[PDB]
Amino acid sequence: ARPLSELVERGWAAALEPVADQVAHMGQFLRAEIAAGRRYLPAGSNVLRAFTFPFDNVRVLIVGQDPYPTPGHAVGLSFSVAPDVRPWPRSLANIFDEYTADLGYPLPSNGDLTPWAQRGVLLLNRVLTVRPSNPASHRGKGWEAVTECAIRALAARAAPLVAILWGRDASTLKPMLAAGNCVAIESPHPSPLSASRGFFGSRPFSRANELLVGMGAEPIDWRLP
Ligand SMILES: O=c1[nH]cc(F)c(=O)[nH]1
Ligand SMILES: [Cl-]
């Protein structure tokens, strides 16, 4: 029970100012969900976690759909799990197969993507909560304006940005991001169902670095332990 500035990093609090009202609304929605006896993921204190790393250092945004639907998996950073979670969700296993294929680094030891978030990657979902076992259950309930505002804010900075958009809902952001300082990469989602359609082979990590370097920005260090 805090205002924006307390929920997110200082730069993000400034960026998300237009949606402070909407964030408060979403808190009221989630309260109502609990009152009704429906659950949501991730934990309340993690819902805005992706915005707890500096808005200024963001260079890449990875965007997915909505949080993992299995309790114990979603932690407020898209695609990430806690470092003691295994087996990994299949989407993450597929992401890590593409990581090794693209970059040649060893398979990660765990599924925690916190290093990426600490290095300038925004790990966003288009929708920031979900009911358990019910993927896409909070689509259309008010998060989209919040995540739109985030993206537009990033795209408005006088800095290079690369977006990696995984799946259909993320793909909706592409036109928003398209001024000349912003470059979006789009592919099918890494989940098993969709990955065969073009996630594998997409080389998003090396491509995003080629793009950053070509715009004069530092590349991302993608290495995971
Ligand atoms: O954070 C997420 N986990 C799983 C997904 F499939 C997705 O889109 N985002
Ligand atoms: Cl529920």
Swiss-Prot record:
A cellular component term, taken from the record's GO annotations: cytoplasm
Disulfide-bonded cysteines: none
InterPro entries the record matches: UDG_fam1 (IPR002043), Ura-DNA_Glyclase_AS (IPR018085), Uracil-DNA_glycosylase-like (IPR005122), Uracil-DNA_glycosylase-like_sf (IPR036895)
GO biological-process terms attached to the record: base-excision repair; base-excision repair, AP site formation via deaminated base removal
GO terms for MF: uracil DNA N-glycosylase activity
Catalyzed chemical reaction(s): Hydrolyzes single-stranded DNA or mismatched double-stranded DNA and polynucleotides, releasing free uracil
Protein name in UniProt: Uracil-DNA glycosylase
Organism: Mycobacterium tuberculosis (strain ATCC 25618 / H37Rv)
Organism ancestry: Bacteria, Bacillati, Actinomycetota, Actinomycetes, Mycobacteriales
